[PDB]
Structure formats: structure tokens, C-alpha cells
Paper text:
To gain insights into the structural basis for the selective inhibition of TcoPYK by sdAb42, the high-resolution structure of the sdAb42:TcoPYK complex was determined through MX. A general overview of the crystal structure reveals that four sdAb42 molecules are bound to the TcoPYK tetramer, which is in accordance with the stoichiometry in solution, previously determined via analytical gel filtration. Interestingly, the epitope of a single sdAb42 spans a region across two TcoPYK subunits linked together along the AA’ dimer interface. While CDR3 contacts residues from both subunits, CDR1 and CDR2 each exclusively interact with amino acids from the A’ and A subunit domains, respectively. Interactions are also provided by the flexible TcoPYK B domain, although these could not be observed in all copies of the asymmetric unit as not all B domains could be built due to lack of electron density. A comparison of the conformation of sdAb42-bound TcoPYK to the enzyme’s R state structure and an inspection of the tell-tale features of T and R state trypanosomatid PYK conformations show that the enzyme resides in its inactive T state when interacting with sdAb42 (the signature Arg311 flip is displayed in Figure 3C). A first finding that supports this idea is that the sdAb42 epitope is significantly distorted when TcoPYK transitions from the T to the R state (Cα RMSD of 3.70 Å). Based on the sdAb42:TcoPYK crystal structure, we hypothesised that sdAb42 inhibits TcoPYK activity by selectively binding and stabilizing the enzyme’s inactive T state. Since the sdAb42 epitope is located relatively far away from both active and effector sites (∼20 and ∼40 Å, respectively), it seems highly unlikely that the observed ‘slow-binding inhibition’ kinetics are the result of a direct competition between sdAb42 and substrates and/or effectors. In other words, the binding of sdAb42 to this AA’ intersubunit site is proposed to prevent TcoPYK from ‘rocking and locking’ into its active R state conformation.
Pyruvate kinase (PYK) represents another attractive glycolytic target. This non-glycosomal enzyme catalyses the last step of the glycolysis (the irreversible conversion of phosphoenolpyruvate (PEP) to pyruvate; Figure 1A). Like most PYKs, trypanosomatid PYKs are homotetramers. Because of their role in ATP production and distribution of fluxes into different metabolic branches, the activity of trypanosomatid PYKs is tightly regulated through an allosteric mechanism known as the ‘rock and lock’ model. By using a combination of enzyme kinetics assays, circular dichroism (CD) spectroscopy and macromolecular X-ray crystallography (MX), we demonstrate that sdAb42 (one of the sdAbs raised against TcoPYK) is a potent inhibitor that impairs enzyme function by selectively binding and stabilizing the enzyme’s inactive T state.
Residue numbers in the entry:
A (entry chain A): 2 to 500
B (entry chain G): 1 to 130
C (entry chain B): 2 to 90, 187 to 501
D (entry chain C): 2 to 499, 515
Write the structure that this text describes.
């Protein structure tokens, strides 16, 4: 029980856990150089997030090139992720970067591209061209996360409106518009979104963070847009409004993973609720054995200060305790004065929470929900984690070429590293968002074919021995596919490391 | 993972004073620990002996401890911005002649037990002649 | 299992649970008025904290009289706590502390928040200072540094309660460590069956803004999940611009976390940690809570005079409110700091001695009826002592509430 | 839970279990014919018992040769057991087959080797030679099974004793006598025992039912008595006196299996306790993973009637519920009018009681006795049984050359058949005495070397297909050794039968 565990914790004993959780880092001005990326990889990064709501294909090509380079230098396999800009009534490019609005003021809200950047305290641009036809005089316009509300007074012109400012606010370039009445009927993928996705498939990204996903049909649209040239890239649905919470079950089934965008959620739902919502979404994800990621608002203040607030640290630790596979930084590492240090703090938080969690509880919980009879595949992975606990194995080594098996093992949440020996680099890259997992590449072309699965097993055990997981006389658990399975691993082996 | 680099030993007159310095590079990337996360101990090994606790300082400098032999004479402090630990030694006496080490523990809190430290400096000779 | 509970939570269902956690409020300029005190009380406060680091004896006498008055008007038993100054910027009881502690004892405060507690010896020095006139007042030891955490077990046996000053802890030890220390200390208290409170850095930004940050909110929720009996406000209610809204915010968070926690995990954990010949006291208490679960009782009415029983039933964390029918008013006030308890007072002088133990029971059932907990047809667990036993509860009755 | 199982039982539903307990038949006048034996085998015999208490090497040679011929005809592997006569006082032979005594008579008991076949109401022979020197006047000499008591009155010659009969009981022939008096200095293996053991070894028996086992050192003496030629033969210690129960822990450790002889036991200890001793012994054997057999007093009334009594049936059923591996028939099959019929009843009782047992209780109870960190060997076997339960496997197929693994899997008591593919016919025959196992033989010489361990797996799957156990679509659990180590199986796969 957690209780017994908790009463046994000591602040004074060093911790000893090999970090299970994974860290996603957004790239931008502070971290786009190759030396920066190398320090980010050394100091814990598993996925590099390219945030397409800003920047040109040139800026993002630089990131892709630079990360592949730093990785190579380091001999790692780093995931690259594309975060879509997404359907969003947006507005920005303010003349001098900014405009301040006082209550009682009147302001022009235009859909003319001539003011698209010359947006002043009197006239600014809103990206939706149907706004004059959808908002009538009287209703409001929520600008910058419901912080700055405007009351429509008149349809001043064909594509401009004269509005009444409720509360003072400092509006910076490109802040989201959140029209309270719906019937906006927003799509799954803007025309920019689509183009960007082809750029991504064309450059070889490993996962899409699709933004503002509300229904399952839209995840399907994202898939369609990725095409067959990228039928294998992960789609990670970004849950950021109440619709996505509402349809979380359909969405989870149509996605490869989930991202809980807490600060976006926070504009429509109260904070005490957002807490609950995170517990439900992460746990559903756990049960589905899909990756789930906590994003918005993590060590926010560490963008400018050398240390976060305790409140923020507990916030991260909660995400871990709650079940999250990954934590993502967004601007802590993009524009921040302490990129590496914040990554290393995330590493310390992850290990502390991991050491602070009863190792068996999740295994037992997940196992009790499993309907019986289990499939063979399910049973193989379940009982591999169970055998691990029972013999006190120090590593599970799964040979998988797609990564399915390693994800199913990680769902059962063992208390040891999972090592995946794969023949595909894309699988190394994509496994970076699955808890406990580390991959190991067997270039078949440059070696045998390993039909007897033996040099791949050696590759795995060699990795575990050199990375401190396992020693002479330790037991390990080998999960792989037999000679005779259409697909999937169905064999397991309990081996002892030999001197 | 983290490495320590000592400087400052020598010969001194009974009653004089020296300042030992230890500079830190590197990290235990696995854990996410750096000099600024780790408590630091200072130990000494006199000729023919094992190696004994002298003093210790917690990660952020907020806690220190000293053996009675050196209380009121020795002061451990640290500058995390410069990745450096200091051991200021005043009113040195012949009984302080020994080789002196800094060591770093993967804990925010220090120990007096040498086996509980993870990385060491390579040691410097301090000789107090009267 | 918590996992199964989580996967069926919904952000859209109104939540229906009676708040089991208790809020402590610090009093200052924004809230010393009797009207303002009444507002705190209506908006969920159960104990008033006096910070003896600032303010004169006259100033706190003012707060004591004003809380007693506003409480009297609302018909509530609010506790009063005296937060010691401590040896601040070494001994345990500063001379100032001694005079402050006797002032509190003479003026009838319900508990001491002993500051900078490091060893169990120091909490016993505090108990000595309280004297026989304060023999029965709660000593709540404030853990605010590393010696406090190192010696937490001795400090828990010697104290009545423990308070985690997480901001104070964060000065010597790193934040991730404070996270772990909080879980350790809360649960050690949970097992010990003694109240634990979380103190600093709570909704601090609400001191000046009308809503807090989401990180702050999860920090409070995470205290509740961690097991804490009470949360405490500090500047939020003393200097703050929104004292009433922040207490209400604490109430909403407490309820949501409570409804998100799995009802049986605590009970099963605490019970399985017990040794196999249980003592009859412990047995009656656990089995009452157990019986409440098995029969889905909506209330547990316990007849304690000292409140011992109420603390013990609380340790097993039942699903429903615990109504304590007591005859000592100081118990009404001290019980405001234990989770799920709500005291009803029976004046033994003004009403005939309830030797039968039967009018107190009725009093309790009527309280539960009006509050809204129990309705005709519902079951309740009644726990008291028999005509002849040695000063502790030993019998338990199961009652179906009837139209009356 | 058994309660929950019990209240769901129906007497009108046909049972559909595969018989897991095993039946041992002793061979005698009604069944020694090759045709009789084939009928016992078809009826469900797994081991043929030879009571060496009676019979010549020529007779037992004949039994041996006939059972091999009958098995060869039916394509079966039947185990042969040799039950020792043991260090047991015997009562010569009596002329005209019988002789009766009345209390108040005087009868001589001589040890003069003469009169061995004469044997009259007036003077008869006994096995012990120093009987005149040990039992002194007044001593109580109990014959048959304590049924008769005699009091020693006279000294007579160096060879003979005059005793007063305290009875009313008719003797049958070459009965045994168990005299309570001490200074008996009981041997472990008599000269007759020793030569009988060699005959068995030289003729190739599969197992010894060692008689009257009291101490562990006796079991070692028996082992010694079998030379290098007999190191592979199982010894099953027959527990038949109070000392047997006294030392059961040492004797279990030293033996390959235990036989609970309840009649023999009932002569020295009260029935009520025999019941308890049976529970104790059987369960300790289950936890040790060694076979235990119940032997005397089984369906004794069926030697001459075509129906057993209900209490007799429940006695058998109780042994199975209790945990017994095998039940053993004695006279019922040796000198009885209904040999095939009583074996078929044993088959029916086994199936009924196995089907009324709760599938999972024994697996759980044994698994919770296990100290944690389990050995890999133990982990592999227990985990294969839990896998079988979770996937609702219809068969476990283990590839074991000595059978150690098959016994370890059986110890965890799965609910489906266990098929053991061996390269050793001795193993096929010896596994006949463990619950739920069925052997399939791979002739290394006839076919390949099955290095891959593939032909054998096919042999096993094929078998379970023809046997009626599995159909295309069902799941099977396969346990074997990898091709990098030897000694014990450490590898497991979950396979769906295809056809």
C-alpha cells in the first residue's frame, strides 16, 4: 500500500531508481543551436517539440537538421514532434508588439488583411473572416484566454466591428480568440495545418501533436492528412477544451496518445475541476496502454528564475503520481534562461516521485481490470511484468520491431527498465514517449539477420550491463516472437546474466 | 559524474591560515545532479591513518557542521554560481597537518561517513610547522 | 482501486459529498471585525489562528473576544489556536513564549501551534509550560526544519498534532524533498491517528487576485489526497483582499479532492496495518467504520466526552460524516481539527443528566437530520459506552432513522 | 471459493473434465493375462503393481512380460511398480487352506523351519527366528492385523512356544504379525527384499513401493540397494505405521513419492486420526511437488459385488479432494470378480470429484506459500500455470527429458491436461504417477535431432489434437529449454492451435 510505503520514505537516503518517465522539450531561441540540443539531450530530452504556431519552414528545417546532428554526435535516437498551429480565431502582429486597452474604450475589430500587423489600440485584425456574420451586437468576444472581453456595439463596416472594452488588458501579438457562442464549426485542420503536416511527413517527423482535438472524427481527419507516406507516424491528440474531455474515450481509441493541455483546459473549466479532469484522462490512458503527456504550466517560472516554486514542483510530481508517461516543457526550454537546469530539475522530480510510488499498485490495478480470458498477446506481456516482480528481475528485454510489445509491457508498469531491441530506427525514435522504455538498434544490413534472435538478445543484455541495470547473477526477462507467430511476441524467457 | 578539483595546500606557520578551494565540473546526467544539488563534505587523513570528517555543508549552504577540533577555527562556505566549495582555516596548529579532501554526496544533506560520498578531489597536503 | 475510480470520474457530474476536511484561518486586519469573522465562519472556517509573532496582548484579546462573539451569534463551536513566536531571528520556550502560553491558558485557547519543534523533549517542555490549567489543550507541533523531519516519530508520539510548514521547510531542503517529506509526515500522522495540518504557500496569490493559479490549486488538492486533516490559510485571510472567497475556494477544492479519492483505500490500508489481536477499543472503532461501509450508513454518531473515540473513528477514514455528541465544550472546539467530525453539544446541567445515554443519541440523530446528512429510512452507526465500563466506548448500535 | 463453487453444482449436468488423477492396479489371478491387462489399460490403469509379498520370479516375470506386450499393443507406456514384501513377520502356510481358533485353546507357535506348509490349529510357523528368545511369558502377540491376540504362556523347546488364544477369529494364510513388544530391531531391507530389488532393477521396473518406511535413513538404504543400474528408479515410501507419520518430513525429502497405506495405518492409530494423518501427508506431498498415492481400503467390497458402498465411494472421493495424485486398487483388481468395472468406477469418481473441486484454490495456496525472490525455474512453472488460467488454455505442453519440469508444473495444479514430450521411455512410464500429465515419446534415433525443439512441439500439439483436448483456435501453453543452456526449462510460449 501507498500508506506503508509513505511512512517508510526518508528525505535523507539517496534514491536509486532508473528514471522511467520521459521529458519532451520545446525548441526555440535559447535551444536551437546544436550545442544547446546536445546539452538538452545530455540533461534528459527524449523528444524535441517543434511548435508550429510560430516560425517558417526554414526555422523548423534548422531545428530538424540540428537535432538529427546533435543526436548523431551523441549516438542517441531522439524523437521529433510537430505541434500543429490548429484552428484558432487568432490575432496579432501589433505595431510595436503590444496594445493596452482600458475599460470604456472603443476599438475596431477588422477582418481586412491591411491591418494584419498594423494593429493598434484603435484597430486590430482578427483572423476569422466570418466574424461580422456570426457575432451580432451585444454578445462578447473573449480575447487572450477569456481575459479581455469585448462587447459588440455595431457592424461598423462590411468586415469591421466597433466594440466596447470590458476590462483593462495588455494584448501581445497573436493571442487566441474564444467566441463564447458556438456554431463556429471549426475544422480539424486549417489549410496551414495541412501544408505543415505534409512538410512534416516529408522531413520525417515521428509524431504529430494535433491541436484542439474535439471529436474522434477529427483525429481521423488528421490521419487522412498524414497520407500513406506517413501512415506510421504517431498522432497525439491535444485535449484542450471541454469537447475533448467529453469525448475522451472515442478520442483515446482513435489516437496513438494523449496530451493534457492544462492551461487551455483552464480557460473553460475551473482549476479544481482541471485537476480531476487530468486524473481521469491520464488514468484512462494508462488503461488503454497509450502514452499520455502533461503539458501547459509545468515549471513555468523557471523560464526566468533559476529555481521553481514548490507549488510548481508538487504540480509536476502530481502529474507523475497521477500516472503521466511524459512531462513537456514549452518555453522553459524555448525562450528560457535556464534550459538545461530546468530539464535536470524535471529529471530529479521524476525520479523522486517514481521512488515515492508503491511499485506494485499500478500493476495490480491494471491487472484487475483485465477481462478474462485475456488474449495471448496481452497475457504474454502481463505475465512478463508479473514474472519480473516475482523473480526480482532488473530489466525486461523485449524484441519488437514496431514497438507494440514494449508499449504493452509498459502499460503493466514494471519496476525495472524495459529494453526494446528493434530493427527500425523510427521505433527507437517513437519509443521516447513510453514509460520505462529504452531502445537499442540492430542494423540488420550491417550485421546478420538474427533469425535465431541471439545477437539482438546480446545487444539488449549488453546495453543493460553497460548502463548499470544488470550485473553477473542478476535475472532478466526476455520477451520476443517465436518462429511460428503471424506477428506479435508470444515467447518469454527468464535468463541470468553470465560473467 | 561530477568531478572535483582541489587547490590550495602547502606549508604554514603555527597560528597562520590557509584557504582550500574545490572546483566542480560535470554532472550525473542519469540522476540530474550537479554540484549545486549536492552537499559537500571536507575530510582529512593524517599520516598513517584513515580519513576523518572535518566539516560539511548542505546543497544550498543553509546547514553546516564541524568536528569540535576545528569549530571556531574552520569555516566551510560555497558559491554555487562559481561551482566552488571553500574551507577557510584559521589559527592552524600542528595537529591539523594532514592531507585534505573535498567530496560530494548525491544528497542534499552531508554525512560524516566517507563511504557515503560519491566523488572526491584528489587531495592536498597541509603542513603546519611552528 | 484508485485507478478504477479515476477512469470513471466525470467533470460534468455535480459532486455530492459532505466536506470532511477542515480549514484553519489566520486572523489579521482584514478579518478581526466581528462581522468579518461571521463571514469567515459561514464560508467554512472551523479554527481561528492567532499569530503571536506580531500583535499585542490587547490585540489578541480583541480577536479572542470577537471570535467568541461571532461564533456565539451563529451557534457554532469554533476553535482558537495560539501560534507561538518561537526562537526566531537554541531553546524551545522563549520567555516571551512562556508569557504568551500562560496568556493563552488563562484566556482559554484550545491549542498551541508550537513553533520550531526539533526534538520530542521540546514539545514536552511546551506541555510543562502549559501547566495543569492547560493540561488538556492540544499541542500541535510545527515541523519547520530538518531536525523536525529527522525526529518526526518522537515528535509525533509527544504531540497531539503536527503541522507541515512547507515554506519554512523549503529553506533548508530542496522542493522535491519537501514533496516527499509532506507525504511521509501526513501518513505517519494518519497511522498515528493524530491531526495533521498543511500551512504555508497555500493560495497565496489569492491574497491580491480574485482567483489563484492552477498550480496552487493542485497543491491544495494534493495535500488533501496526501491525507491531511486540515489546510491552513495565512496572509490570505489576515491581510488579504478576498478573505471570504478564498475560504470558499478551499471548500470547493476540499470537496472535489474528497470526491476524487477512493473511499475504501484509506480504511483498508489503516486496518491491514493493525496487529492481529486488536484491542477492544481499536476493534470497536474500526468495526464501526467497517459496518458503516457494509451498510452504507450516512452517519456515525459517537458519544465521546474527551473526543478520543472521535479521533479513533476518524483515523479509519469512513465514507460519511462523524457526529460527536459531547458534554465538554472544549471537546466541541478541539474536534474542529479532525477530519469528518462535527460536534453536537449536550448541556448536562441545563438538561437532565443523560445517564441512559439516550437523549444525547437523539440529539445527534436530530442534528444529522437537519444538517441534511440522514433522511428517514437511512441507517446510522451509533457508538458509545455502556452503563458499566471504565471510561471508553465499547458498544455499537445500528439504527434506521424514522420519521420523527 | 469452494463454497461459491459448491452452491453452483448440478447433478444433472454432464461433466466435462479430463481425468487428471491416475490409477494404479495390482496384478494377480484375475488380470495377469495379456487380454486382461489390455482391458485394464483401456479401463484406465497407469501403473501395474506387483505385490512381491507373494509370488515367484517366474510369476512376476510373466506379469512384467505381459504388461509390456499389452502396452505395446495399445501403443501405451505403462509404468511397472515393485511393492516390497518388507520387514514384516509372516505366518507360514496353513494346510487345507484355513484353520480357526476358539478362546481358551492352546496353540503352539514354532520357528522350526519345518511345518511351514503344514500349519494346523495345534502348531504353526512364523517368520521371526528369535521369537522364542524375545517374547517372554504373558507377552501379547497380535496376528492378522491385531485382529487376533495371543498370550505367551510356555517356554517349550528352543523352537516352539505354547500360547493361549484370546479370540474368536478364523485365520487365512501367510498373514503378517505385528507384535507390540520392543527389542524387534526391525531391518530396512531383508535379504529377500534385496534380491527382489535386484530382480526389479535387472528386469527394468520403473518404481519401488518401499514397504514399512519409518525413518529417512531407511529410504537411503533402499536407494543404496539399487545400484548404478537403479539410480533412475523412483522410490515411493509406504507410510504404514506411527513412525512413518512421525518422520514424514525427512521421508518426503528423501523419497521420490509417498504412499499412504491407510489400513496398515489404522492398525496402530485411531481411524479419526488416520483421516487427519491422510490430510497432513497428502498436503505436505503437494507442497513438496512429489506424488502421493492412497492405497488400502479403496473399493474393497467390489472384489465380490458389482457395486461399492456409498461410504467407500466417498472415501475415494475424499482422497481426491484431499489432494491425492493417485489412488491404488489392491484385491479388487488382483483377485476380484469385477476388475474392469472397478477400474471404471475409479475413473468415474476421479472425474466427478475433480469437477467438484474449485479450479483455483490449490494453485493459489501453493503460490502463496512461495518465498519471494522465486528461483527462475519455479517462476517459469508457476507462471505457466497462471498463464494457462488467464488465457483459458486447454493444454500445457512441456518438453522435459527427465520429467522434473512436468512434476513442477503439476505441483501448481492447473485445470487442463499437461502433455510431456520426452526422449526417454523411462520418463514416459514414470510420469504415470503425477496428476494431469500424459507422455508423448520422441524417438531421437527414428527421426531428427529436434535441436530447434520443433518436431517435439508438433508431436505434442498433434497428440492433444487427436486426444480430444484442443481444436484449431484454442490456446496452448508450451514450456521448454532454450538452445543456449541445458539442465532445466526456462522458456515459455503461448500458441493458438491452427488447422
Amino acid at each position: 500500500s501507498q500508506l506503508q510505503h509513505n511512512i517508510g520514505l526518508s528525505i535523507f537516503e539517496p534514491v536509486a531508481k532508473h528514471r522511467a518517465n520521459r521529458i519532451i522539450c520545446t525548441i526555440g531561441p535559447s535551444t536551437q543551436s546544436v550545442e544547446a540540443l546536445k546539452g538538452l539531450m545530455k540533461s534528459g530530452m527524449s523528444v524535441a517539440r517543434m511548435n508550429f504556431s510560430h516560425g517558417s519552414y526554414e526555422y523548423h528545417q534548422t531545428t530538424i537538421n540540428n537535432v538529427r546532428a546533435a543526436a548523431a554526435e551523441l549516438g542517441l535516437h531522439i524523437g521529433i514532434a510537430l505541434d500543429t498551429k490548429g484552428p484558432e480565431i487568432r490575432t496579432g502582429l501589433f505595431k510595436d508588439g503590444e496594445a493596452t486597452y482600458a475599460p470604456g474604450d472603443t476599438v475596431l475589430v477588422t477582418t481586412d488583411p491591411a491591418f494584419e500587423k498594423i494593429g493598434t489600440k484603435e484597430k486590430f485584425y482578427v483572423d476569422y473572416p466570418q466574424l461580422p456574420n456570426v457575432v451580432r451586437p451585444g454578445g462578447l468576444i473573449y480575447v487572450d484566454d477569456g481575459v479581455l472581453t469585448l462587447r459588440v456595439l455595431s457592424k461598423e463596416d462590411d468586415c469591421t466591428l466597433k466594440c466596447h472594452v470590458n476590462n483593462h488588458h495588455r494584448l501581445t501579438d497573436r493571442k487566441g480568440i474564444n467566441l463564447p457562442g458556438c456554431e463556429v464549426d471549426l475544422p480539424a485542420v486549417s489549410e496551414k495545418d495541412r501544408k505543415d503536416l505534409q512538410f512534416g511527413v516529408e522531413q520525417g517527423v515521428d509524431m504529430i501533436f494535433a491541436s484542439f482535438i474535439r471529436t474522434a472524427d477529427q483525429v481521423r481527419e488528421v490521419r487522412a492528412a498524414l497520407g500513406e507516406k506517413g501512415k506510421d507516424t504517431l498522432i497525439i491528440s491535444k485535449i484542450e477544451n471541454h469537447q475533448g474531455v467529453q469525448n475522451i474515450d472515442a478520442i483515446i481509441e482513435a489516437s496513438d496518445g494523449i496530451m493534457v493541455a492544462r492551461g487551455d483546459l483552464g480557460v473553460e473549466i475551473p482549476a479544481e475541476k482541471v485537476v480531476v479532469a487530468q486524473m481521469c484522462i491520464i488514468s484512462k490512458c494508462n488503461v488503454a496502454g497509450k502514452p499520455v503527456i502533461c503539458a501547459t504550466q509545468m515549471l513555468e517560472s523557471m523560464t526566468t528564475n533559476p529555481r521553481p516554486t514548490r507549488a510548481e514542483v508538487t504540480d509536476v510530481a502530481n502529474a507523475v503520481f497521477n500516472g503521466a508517461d511524459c512531462v513537456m516543457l514549452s518555453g522553459e526550454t524555448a525562450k528560457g534562461k535556464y534550459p538545461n537546469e530546468v530539464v535536470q530539475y524535471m529529471v530529479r522530480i521524476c525520479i523522486e516521485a517514481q521512488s515515492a510510488t508503491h511499485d506494485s499498485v499500478m500493476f495490480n490495478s491494471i491487472k484487475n481490470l483485465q477481462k478474462i480470458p485475456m488474449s495471448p498477446e496481452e497475457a504474454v506481456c502481463s505475465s512478463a511484468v508479473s514474472s519480473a516482480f516475482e523473480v526480482q528481475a532488473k530489466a525486461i528485454l523485449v524484441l519488437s520491431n514496431t514497438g507494440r510489445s514494449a508499449r504493452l509491457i509498459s502499460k503493466y508498469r514494471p519496476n525495472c527498465p524495459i529494453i526494446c531491441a528493434t530493427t527500425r530506427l523510427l521505433t527507437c525514435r517513437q519509443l521516447n514517449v513510453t514509460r520505462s522504455v529504452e531502445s537499442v538498434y540492430y542494423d540488420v544490413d550491417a550485421h546478420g539477420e538474427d533469425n535465431d534472435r541471439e545477437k539482438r538478445v546480446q545487444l539488449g543484455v549488453d546495453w543493460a550491463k553497460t548502463k548499470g541495470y544488470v550485473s553477473a547473477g542478476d535475472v532478466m526477462v526476455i520477451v520476443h516472437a517465436d518462429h511460428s507467430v503471424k506477428g506479435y511476441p508470444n515467447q518469454t524467457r527468464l535468463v541470468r546474466v553470465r560473467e | 559524474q561530477v568531478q572535483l578539483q582541489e587547490s590550495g595546500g602547502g606549508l604554514v606557520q603555527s597560528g597562520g591560515s590557509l584557504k582550500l578551494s574545490c572546483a566542480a565540473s560535470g554532472s550525473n546526467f542519469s540522476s540530474g545532479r550537479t554540484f549545486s544539488t549536492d552537499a559537500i563534505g571536507w575530510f582529512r587523513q593524517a599520516p598513517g591513518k584513515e580519513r576523518e570528517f572535518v566539516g560539511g555543508i548542505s546543497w544550498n549552504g543553509g546547514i553546516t557542521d564541524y568536528v569540535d577540533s576545528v569549530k571556531g577555527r574552520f569555516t566551510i562556505s560555497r558559491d554555487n554560481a562559481k561551482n566552488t566549495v571553500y574551507l577557510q582555516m584559521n589559527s592552524l596548529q600542528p595537529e591539523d597537518t594532514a592531507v585534505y579532501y573535498c567530496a560530494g554526496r548525491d544528497s542534499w544533506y552531508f554525512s560524516k561517513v566517507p563511504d557515503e560520498y560519491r566523488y572526491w578531489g584528489q587531495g592536498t597536503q597541509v603542513t603546519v610547522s611552528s
